[PDB]
Write an enzyme that holds these catalytic residues in place. Structure first.
Site, PDB file in Angstrom:
ATOM      1  N   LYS A  34     -13.683   9.335  -4.178  1.00  0.00           N
ATOM      2  CA  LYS A  34     -15.212   9.554  -3.812  1.00  0.00           C
ATOM      3  C   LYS A  34     -15.802  10.957  -3.885  1.00  0.00           C
ATOM      4  O   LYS A  34     -16.830  11.153  -4.545  1.00  0.00           O
ATOM      5  CB  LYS A  34     -15.160   9.577  -2.187  1.00  0.00           C
ATOM      6  CG  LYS A  34     -14.590   8.332  -1.584  1.00  0.00           C
ATOM      7  CD  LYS A  34     -14.089   8.356  -0.187  1.00  0.00           C
ATOM      8  CE  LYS A  34     -13.634   7.079   0.578  1.00  0.00           C
ATOM      9  NZ  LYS A  34     -13.059   7.436   1.619  1.00  0.00           N
ATOM     10  N   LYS A  94       0.921  14.504   2.580  1.00  0.00           N
ATOM     11  CA  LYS A  94      -0.310  14.950   2.166  1.00  0.00           C
ATOM     12  C   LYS A  94      -0.273  16.501   1.646  1.00  0.00           C
ATOM     13  O   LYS A  94      -1.153  17.043   0.791  1.00  0.00           O
ATOM     14  CB  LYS A  94      -1.277  14.755   2.916  1.00  0.00           C
ATOM     15  CG  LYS A  94      -1.566  13.303   3.671  1.00  0.00           C
ATOM     16  CD  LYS A  94      -2.269  12.054   2.617  1.00  0.00           C
ATOM     17  CE  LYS A  94      -2.718  10.883   3.401  1.00  0.00           C
ATOM     18  NZ  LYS A  94      -3.623  10.028   2.804  1.00  0.00           N
ATOM     19  N   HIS A 135       0.719  -1.233  -0.048  1.00  0.00           N
ATOM     20  CA  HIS A 135      -0.042   0.135   0.063  1.00  0.00           C
ATOM     21  C   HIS A 135       0.726   1.257  -0.080  1.00  0.00           C
ATOM     22  O   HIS A 135       0.202   2.290  -0.343  1.00  0.00           O
ATOM     23  CB  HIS A 135      -0.901   0.006   1.176  1.00  0.00           C
ATOM     24  CG  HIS A 135      -2.039  -1.032   1.210  1.00  0.00           C
ATOM     25  ND1 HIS A 135      -3.230  -0.798   0.623  1.00  0.00           N
ATOM     26  CD2 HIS A 135      -2.081  -2.234   1.508  1.00  0.00           C
ATOM     27  CE1 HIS A 135      -3.877  -1.866   0.708  1.00  0.00           C
ATOM     28  NE2 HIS A 135      -3.146  -2.895   1.460  1.00  0.00           N
ATOM     29  N   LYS A 164      -8.375  14.142   5.005  1.00  0.00           N
ATOM     30  CA  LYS A 164      -7.734  12.662   4.842  1.00  0.00           C
ATOM     31  C   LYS A 164      -7.020  12.844   6.314  1.00  0.00           C
ATOM     32  O   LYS A 164      -6.926  13.973   6.721  1.00  0.00           O
ATOM     33  CB  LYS A 164      -6.884  12.780   3.763  1.00  0.00           C
ATOM     34  CG  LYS A 164      -5.777  13.972   3.583  1.00  0.00           C
ATOM     35  CD  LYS A 164      -6.038  14.572   2.415  1.00  0.00           C
ATOM     36  CE  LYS A 164      -5.277  13.961   1.099  1.00  0.00           C
ATOM     37  NZ  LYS A 164      -6.278  13.379   0.227  1.00  0.00           N
ATOM     38  N   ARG A 165      -5.865  11.831   6.591  1.00  0.00           N
ATOM     39  CA  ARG A 165      -5.136  12.087   7.743  1.00  0.00           C
ATOM     40  C   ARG A 165      -3.984  13.012   7.693  1.00  0.00           C
ATOM     41  O   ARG A 165      -3.541  13.426   6.355  1.00  0.00           O
ATOM     42  CB  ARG A 165      -4.560  10.729   7.890  1.00  0.00           C
ATOM     43  CG  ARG A 165      -5.622   9.542   8.427  1.00  0.00           C
ATOM     44  CD  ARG A 165      -6.001   9.866   9.898  1.00  0.00           C
ATOM     45  NE  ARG A 165      -4.877   9.903  10.660  1.00  0.00           N
ATOM     46  CZ  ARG A 165      -4.583   8.857  11.591  1.00  0.00           C
ATOM     47  NH1 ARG A 165      -5.498   7.769  11.444  1.00  0.00           N
ATOM     48  NH2 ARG A 165      -3.677   8.845  12.331  1.00  0.00           N
ATOM     49  N   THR A 220      -7.950   7.223  -1.962  1.00  0.00           N
ATOM     50  CA  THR A 220      -9.275   6.529  -2.258  1.00  0.00           C
ATOM     51  C   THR A 220     -10.266   7.924  -2.232  1.00  0.00           C
ATOM     52  O   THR A 220     -11.369   7.797  -2.889  1.00  0.00           O
ATOM     53  CB  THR A 220      -9.605   5.543  -1.475  1.00  0.00           C
ATOM     54  OG1 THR A 220      -9.454   5.614  -0.145  1.00  0.00           O
ATOM     55  CG2 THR A 220      -9.003   4.210  -2.122  1.00  0.00           C
TER      56      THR A 220
END
Ligand SMILES: [N-]=[N+]=N[C@]1(C(N)O)O[C@H](CO)[C@@H](O)[C@H](O)[C@H]1O
Ligand SMILES: [N-]=[N+]=N[C@]1(C(N)O)O[C@H](CO)[C@@H](O)[C@H](O)[C@H]1O
Ligand SMILES: *Cc1c(COP(=O)(O)O)cnc(C)c1O
Ligand SMILES: *Cc1c(COP(=O)(O)O)cnc(C)c1O
Lengths: 810, 810
Positions: free
Chosen positions: B654, B548, B351, B542-543, B650
């Protein structure tokens, strides 16, 4: 099907069956192809449970509408045992369920054996609370049982190499279909912190908070549609608890340990912090619930008219200063008004006089854990002693004797003195016990406030202890006098006119024989043990204690054995001596007594010369469900505690109601039992309380008995030489040493009269007809020992409420 | 009522209502007079649950009869979120339940908000497992999800003074109506001990035993009557555990701590013993269950034909040596045969490539905890390296690079190397990620066994991520192309012919506007925050991670603010910038980024000159249920990770399915998303993977960007001087220092192109019609990102099973 088990109606059996299948499918999520007996047990439990809810909801709604005085029974123990059969009995569903499961191709008795015992108790005290709940529901009282939901109840006892081994009682493993969690009613409980004295009042601050989550269990009355509630608190940590991160979450268990396990001590005080926390936890959560309910019925003057709090021993004694704390600190009532309310609300029940069971908490513990409560206790003591001083001017020693605070090595708080001062009623649990309280232990308090002291002789519920465990006996009794006795035990008197009835004598004896065969079978099924069903069943089951004197029983067993070996070809009445009971994990002597028992069995049970004439068996893991099996099968009930040590006892009552004759001392309730049945129908022996005191004045010297009794000497020498422990010759040195030099219970002093009395028992057993007639005289006069009588007395003489046998709507 | 929500039949609404009342009465033991919204929620949950059981039982009985190949998805995380609505959707019960509760005078939406999220996951990986379960059930695969039932899932995030505060996620507090405990299937798991080498085989002895108790949760497929199972293990101590007495019982919690809490680390490896225990616990219990089921379908040659085990990352990597241990030590298969079976049975999914997430367990830990497994791992390594040596003679460095054992400070086991060696398939989660695996991280392994490496681009379930969270959009889509797209997302293509349809454009835009109003409202209800519904909803959820690059988003926000203050009376497209996500408790920088965000909001949201033109909001406690609310309301989706760091992502999918336009880098799945929709319909910017590498060759110097970009300089100087932290001027020194001297993610390098791209976004938003047309082009081409496609590929290319859309009987 037997009559006392209800009707097996067409419509209801059909209804029971579909609901059973509905639960097996929708609730258990199983099909018949993969269902196991345990699954079937649960489907039945849920089906029966469904019949309660309707009544549970309307009973509670009923109390809300009529708003009667509420009875709050606080106890750290509720020895409930199994719930399935009891619920069917009280709901008149036993035959219907029996039929329904039969049609489904299942044996209901097999399924009942799968239910786990709710062993949230140690023995007498816990079981008493259980019987009381049953009676209160049966008498239509708005009563609530409040306690702790221990994750682990009394440990399961295993015997390895003849030694007791303890193992966690994970009774919730497979779930509990009877309880209903009520997370929505969670309440905060405070610990530690400190006390701040501001202008308008004192404040308890900087405390650690633990949440109390309630679980409600229904308590159905006997066929009266009343279903009361037993609310057990569970400890939960707040979510911002300890809130590196992982550890904080894991440490949540520190707070939740409060309700993790029941202290396995029977009549023994252990001053551990965890125990004190459990005591305050149950008290703090319960009182908030009580007040809450009261405010929803602010002059607290009416509080005592709507609320009664019964303290089952001193375990929940902190309810007194906690009630004061709330009324004074939170509601802002003046001290004197608050005290008046507290005293009129609380009543205390004392269960024992032995010093080692008395709760005396070190002040440094209360100081750290409950600082505000310690202050309140000092204030209560201060004002109480001022009353004593004013009543007995100059009696300085009386002042120190009555203080709630004990000086010495470490200062301690005498919780019993606390309970007496803060309660309007204090009762013992048997006439002789209650008198002893007034004459000895609480003499000073009795002199100051004689009106407070009462007696409430214990009792047992005839539902579980007759109808449920001995249906055969309940039936033949019903065939003669009807069913009304089940909720009016005094009616058993009518059986006195059948004492010469040949048919009845034959039936009473038949039921006993069937019970014995059934137990002799169970013995071989679950514990690979063969016994002779024709022998006299001599049983002593209760917690292992030196005061219960299982050792005296042992001495008799060895005496019988030695006599047989002396004259092998002489006839003696065959006996199966059964002794069972758990020993507290840290009670060394109790554990040695268990080993001694098994050791005796090892020798006696394998001696060819003895044959089937004498068998010594130790009943493993004695608990409520096992009591329901052995008691109905017993012929002889051993209640041989040293006079003055067994406050009341309740096992004795169970045996009397079930057709066993009693051999015992004039101790506890044995005195009232013999009085009710007639001493001629009892096997009484040994020293009376007065004889014990005379011996103490004189000085108890065991050597004297050892020197004057050859048979006794032989036994001690057998124990000392290793006759019962070949590989470890000195294995029982502690026992012998205790018996000879520091026996607080005078085992030797009652030996002679005990074996003599045992001979009279054997003589009567040789005459079946007369033995049974004496049994009938016992069963017929056991009515007084129904907990319905006990509860009716508490209700009228302490709580101020009238019991009622009125059936609530369907 | 909307069409996609099913029929509200007369008979079924009536049936639902009585069952709702039956549960409220019999299950919850409440009457309407005291029932609270939570009680109503549970009555509904139990009513809906009833409709599953029938199908759950026959689906399982079905697999037993037909005995197809079983798919076992092992994961330490299953980010399920709420279950009520999802179950209604998949069962076509939503309108019926809506109607039934309406008639009962209840608002179903209000009740759904009461359900607690099952947050047994951290983010992407956990949610992926959840979507996969849904798709596997929908595709009729005999699949089982296996994990751990954590008592506490991902922590609930609270923002205090702008700082993140964590608090226990006690999700089981009020109970979980969806799970079914299966204590009867408890299995033992071993830890510690030692290895004995006897004649016929090695033995793992003197181990500490922990029991694994399973809890089954139903996983319904989409309207196909298939209900699979998710089995979560719970740790339980054996009853003779530690079995002074009190302590032994209390220490039981040591063993039960294994399933107490989810490690809250997202893409970050923490080598803690408790974590390793969780990993082995789930693996050991699961494999016994798997074998058990296989033996009841002994030549294990057919094992790979009846069993497929998918390793979700390396967390359950011990399944490889555990499978070997069982086959070799217990079943006595020869090593080579056992290995063949193990490789053909296991498949591994990687992942992420970031080094700090890679699991490298210290040998001394495995040595103590799992001694037999360490030996097996050495043996596997030995034989594996012999294969490498034979394939690349003399390439000594390759040998050390591919070893499962890493030398150095402390020896460690590279779990990723273990998984590759013991699996017949290894896949990445997005095309670019999978290519990177072959070119970089696992280049050596790819060279040795090219056939093993595959790609399986992630996906999301259109049930929860469209139908459930955005019924309005699902409806207007259904009005045009029907309902078949819900289980065949590729059909959304047909919407391309409506791109010029005036009515459709109007509806798509209307649904979005309604979603925004609904969210703008929710914001004010549960968090007292007012926002302008006409502004562009710019969201990044998101986290919190440095890769990120929430910080890059922050720089843009500050840029917008500075530009406004520079020319106040100039027109700019209004924006509501929403950033949400949790930071791991021990991730300092992540926590500082959250504070920076709130700090920016403090300044921007209260500057009179800015007005309603710019708002900065931090979405508190971002979780699945919150994602279902914000995503449908978003206009702009921020997917701005540094190229090469986000394996797939992901959340991006969405947002695309729900009508949001995407601004992002050519990273992870963004590449395939832009490829599917067309780059003209995407807002792509920044360095590509190749540009990042060029910069690393060269050497990344942030100062250079600071020197050449005035606007960027101004921002850094504002942060440094305390413009955003008056009381604590140096509060953000760590952030500035990191950005300037040790930024592993090159935030500055993408700044210019990022704000430039953001300007193009604002320009298009000014043209409502064209913005919506681009949205339609995105929604219409999002079909490929359905997890049904992903799962069908795993099924055919890895597991060797054919998906089926056949509806099982009722
Ligand atoms: N606690 N306490 N004491 C006892 C007991 N549990 O055994 O209370 C029982 C219930 O009152 C009494 O019958 C018994 O004699 C007395 O020793
Ligand atoms: N574990 N892990 N890694 C991730 C994640 N949880 O965020 O797996 C997710 C599911 O494969 C990926 O979408 C994501 O990019 C990747 O970083
Ligand atoms: C009734 C009972 C007791 C109390 O017995 P005594 O002989 O009075 O000590 C103890 N344990 C159990 C399980 C009981 O049923
Ligand atoms: C989908 C989802 C994620 C993954 O989002 P990314 O932006 O890919 O990191 C994380 N958390 C929740 C609650 C999600 O629904």
């Amino acid at each position: 099907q037997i009559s006392v088990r209800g009707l097996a109606g067409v419509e209801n059996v059909t209804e029971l069956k579909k609901n059973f299948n509905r639960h097996l499918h929708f609730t258990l999520v199983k099909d018949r192809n993969v269902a196991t007996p345990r699954d079937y047990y649960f489907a039945l439990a849920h089906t029966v449970r469904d019949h309660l809810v309707g009544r549970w909801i309307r009973t509670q709604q009923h109390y809300y509408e009529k708003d009667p005085k509420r009875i709050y029974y606080l106890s750290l123990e509720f020895y409930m045992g199994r719930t399935l059969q009891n619920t069917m009995v009280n709901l008149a569903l036993e035959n219907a369920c029996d039929e329904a499961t039969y049609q489904l191709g299942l044996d209901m008795e097999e399924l009942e054996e799968i239910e786990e015992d709710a062993g949230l108790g140690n023995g007498g005290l816990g079981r008493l609370a259980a019987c009381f709940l049953d009676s209160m529901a049966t008498l239509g009282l708005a009563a609530y049982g409040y306690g702790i939901r221990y994750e682990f109840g009394i440990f399961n006892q295993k015997i390895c190499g003849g030694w007791q081994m303890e193992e966690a009682d994970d009774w919730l493993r497979y779930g509990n279909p009877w309880e209903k969690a009520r997370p929505e009613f969670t309440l905060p409980v405070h610990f530690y912190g400190r006390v701040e004295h501001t202008s308008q009042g004192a404040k308890w601050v900087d405390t650690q908070v633990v949440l109390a989550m309630p679980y409600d269990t229904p308590v159905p009355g006997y066929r009266n549609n009343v279903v009361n509630t037993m609310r057990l608190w569970s400890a939960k940590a707040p979510n911002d608890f300890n809130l590196g991160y992982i550890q904080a979450v894991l440490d949540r268990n520190l707070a939740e340990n409060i309700s993790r396990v029941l202290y396995p001590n029977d009549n023994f005080f252990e001053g551990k912090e965890l125990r004190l926390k459990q005591e305050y936890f149950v008290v703090a959560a319960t009182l908030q619930d009580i007040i809450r309910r009261f405010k929803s019925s602010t002059n607290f003057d009416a509080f005592p008219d709507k609320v009664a709090i019964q303290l089952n021993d001193t375990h929940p004694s902190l309810a007194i200063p906690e009630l004061m704390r709330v009324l004074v600190d939170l509601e802002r009532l003046d001290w004197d008004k608050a005290w008046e309310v507290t005293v009129k609300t609380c009543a205390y029940t004392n269960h024992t006089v032995i010093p080692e069971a008395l709760e005396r908490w070190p002040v440094h513990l209360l100081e750290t854990l409950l600082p505000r409560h310690l202050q309140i206790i000092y204030e209560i003591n201060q004002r109480f002693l001022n009353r004593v001083a004013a009543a007995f001017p100059g009696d300085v020693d009386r002042l120190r004797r009555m203080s709630l605070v004990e000086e010495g090595a470490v200062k301690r708080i005498n919780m019993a003195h606390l309970c007496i001062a803060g309660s309007h009623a204090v009762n013992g649990v048997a006439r002789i016990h209650s008198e002893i309280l007034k004459k000895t232990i609480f003499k000073d308090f009795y002199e100051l406030e004689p009106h407070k002291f009462q007696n409430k002789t214990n009792g047992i519920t005839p539902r579980r202890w007759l109808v449920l465990c001995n249906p055969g006996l309940a039936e033949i009794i019903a065939e003669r006098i009807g069913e009304e006795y089940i909720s009016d035990l005094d009616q058993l008197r009518k059986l006195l006119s059948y004492v010469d009835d040949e048919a009845f004598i034959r039936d009473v004896a038949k039921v006993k024989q069937e019970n014995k065969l059934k137990f002799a079978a169970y013995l071989e099924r679950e514990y690979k043990v063969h016994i002779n069903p024709n022998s006299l069943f001599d049983v002593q089951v209760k917690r292992i204690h030196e005061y219960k004197r299982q050792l005296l029983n042992c001495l008799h067993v060895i005496t019988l054995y030695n006599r047989i070996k002396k004259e092998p070809n002489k006839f003696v009445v065959p006996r199966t001596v059964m002794i069972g009971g758990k020993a507290a994990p840290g009670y060394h002597m109790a554990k040695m007594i268990i080993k001694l028992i098994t050791a005796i069995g090892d020798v006696v049970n394998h001696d060819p010369v003895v044959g089937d004439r004498l068998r010594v068996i130790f009943l493993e893991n004695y608990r409520v469900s096992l009591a329901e099996k052995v008691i109905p099968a017993a012929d002889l009930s051993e209640q041989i505690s040293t006079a003055g040590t067994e406050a009341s006892g309740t096992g004795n009552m169970k045996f009397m109601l079930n057709g066993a004759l009693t051999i015992g001392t004039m101790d506890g309730a044995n005195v009232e039992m013999a009085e009710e049945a007639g001493e001629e129908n009892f096997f009484i022996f040994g020293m009376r309380v007065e004889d014990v005191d005379r011996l103490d004045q004189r000085g108890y010297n065991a050597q004297e008995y050892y020197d004057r009794i050859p048979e006794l000497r032989q036994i001690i020498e057998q124990l000392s030489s290793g006759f019962f422990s070949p590989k470890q010759p000195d294995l029982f040195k502690d026992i012998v040493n205790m018996l000879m030099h520091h026996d607080r219970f005078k085992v030797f002093a009652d030996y002679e009269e005990y074996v003599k009395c045992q001979e009279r028992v054997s003589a009567l057993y040789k005459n079946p007809r007369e033995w049974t007639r004496m049994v009938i005289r016992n069963i017929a006069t056991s009515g007084k020992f129904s907990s319905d009588r006990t509860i009716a007395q508490y209700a009228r003489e302490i709580w101020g409420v009238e019991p009622s046998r009125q059936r609530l709507p369907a």
